[PDB]
């Protein structure tokens, strides 16, 4: 028979998941009600794709989208200049948050982007996407603009998740936070959140950032605050060593949130969380 996890999943899908997120750009603009929207593309040596991603979002600039920023992580290729020519604002880690020395990894970039943006809603889109669709941003912000109580929207793709998602993230969530197994692509890089939420949570480093944000949001607000939207079809993207490193950090970040100690020992082959940005810039009682 059904479990409590099953029952919650079914109703969460009914209320908080959209297979056909067909809101129009015009209706979303009309719903902003004074809120502004920032779009952030984290980038490190993505010269072949960053411009193409920017180009798909640029038509929204000045209407639905208020700012379009490429947060560069120290690229040595032509990422920055291609993002400039394509119509984005390029901001380095150092300019985004001058008072803190950078550390490596994606989570650092997304955290710093909170200091460099002003939008009430922040949308993250990976800069390595080959086939970005222009409706990604509208779909991601729909539930934030139209659905009471939602603070985090995860974009998922139908396929014509991957290995880390299905072997590592979802099974560990089943063990530790089973309600969150309803989220189809918990590691996805296309997602949006409110400034209120994102400024208030720590940011995990590196490959842990997505899972960390998902679990921190759940632990504070539960499923009601999390939604997901189908962004369309896309094929699964990596070398096993990259995936194993990803997994190891997903494990470390989940463990840090779920009361499991971690040796700190990285993968044998043959760094810390950043505090909430509201400690530097700018309820759901259990009683």
- Residue numbering of the annotated binding site for (S)-malate: 162, 164-165, 237
Nearest distance from residue 248's CB to ligand UDP, in Å? 12
Partner whose footprint covers residue 189, from ligand UDP, its own copies, none (CB < 5 to 8 Å by kind): ligand UDP
- Give dist(CA 192, CA 204) in Å, integer: 17
Residue 242 binds its own copies (CB under 8 A): no
Q: After which residues is the chain broken (C to N over 2.5 A)?
A: 160, 237, 270, 282
Residue 12 vs 203, nearer CB to its own copies = 12
Beta strands in 201-254 (DSSP E): 226-233
Interface segment toward its own copies; rule CB under 8 A; list 22-30, 46-54, 163-171, 202-210? 163-171
Interface segment toward its own copies; rule CB under 8 A; list 88-96, 185-193, 204-212, 260-268? 260-268
Q: What's the residue count for the chain?
A: 287
Encode 65-91: b = buried (16+ Cβ within 10 Å), e = exposed.
Answer: bbbbbbbbbebeebbbebbeebebbbb
Residues 276/216, Cβ–Cβ less than 8 Å:
no
Q: How far is CA 262 from the centre of its chain?
A: 24
Residues 198/276, Cβ–Cβ less than 8 Å:
no
- Please report, as ranges, the residues that interact with ligand UDP according to CB under 6 A: 42-44, 46, 73, 104-106, 109, 126-128, 189, 242
Partner whose footprint covers residue 127, from ligand UDP, its own copies, none (CB < 5 to 8 Å by kind): ligand UDP
Task: Enumerate binding residues for its own copies (CB under 8 A).
Answer: 3, 5-6, 9, 163-164, 166-168, 170-172, 174-176, 178, 181-182, 184, 240, 243-244, 247-248, 251-252, 255, 258, 260-263, 265-268, 270
């Amino acid at each position: 028979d059904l479990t409590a996890t099953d029952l919650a999943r079914h109703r969460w899908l009914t209320d908080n998941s959209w297979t056909r997120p067909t809101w129009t750009v015009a209706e979303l603009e009309a719903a902003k009600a004074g809120r502004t929207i920032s779009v952030v593309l984290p980038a490190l040596n993505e010269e072949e794709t960053v411009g193409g991603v920017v180009e798909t979002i640029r038509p929204l600039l000045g209407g639905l989208v208020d700012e379009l920023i490429v947060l560069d992580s120290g690229s040595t290729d032509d990422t920055e200049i291609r993002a400039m020519a394509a119509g984005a604002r390029v901001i380095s880690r150092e300019v985004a948050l001058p008072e803190v020395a950078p550390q490596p990894g994606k989570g650092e970039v997304l955290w710093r982007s909170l200091a460099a943006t002003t939008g009430d809603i922040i949308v993250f889109i990976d800069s390595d996407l080959i086939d970005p669709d222009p409706m990604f941003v509208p779909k991601l912000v729909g539930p934030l603009l139209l659905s009471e109580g939602v603070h985090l929207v995860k974009g998922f793709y139908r396929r014509p998740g991957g290995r880390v998602t299905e072997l590592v993230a979802r099974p560990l969530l089943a063990a530790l936070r089973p309600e969150l197994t309803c989220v189809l692509q918990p590691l996805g890089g296309e997602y949006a959140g409110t400034r209120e939420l994102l400024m208030s949570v720590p940011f995990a480093p590196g490959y842990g950032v997505e899972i960390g944000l998902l679990v921190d949001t759940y632990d504070r607000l539960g499923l009601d605050a999390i939604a997901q939207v189908n962004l369309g079809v896309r094929a699964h993207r990596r070398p096993l060593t990259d995936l194993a490193a990803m997994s190891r950090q997903v494990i470390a970040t989940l463990f840090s949130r779920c009361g499991v100690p971690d040796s700190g020992v990285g993968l044998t082959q043959f760094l810390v969380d950043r505090p909430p940005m509201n400690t530097l810039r700018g309820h759901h009682h259990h009683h």
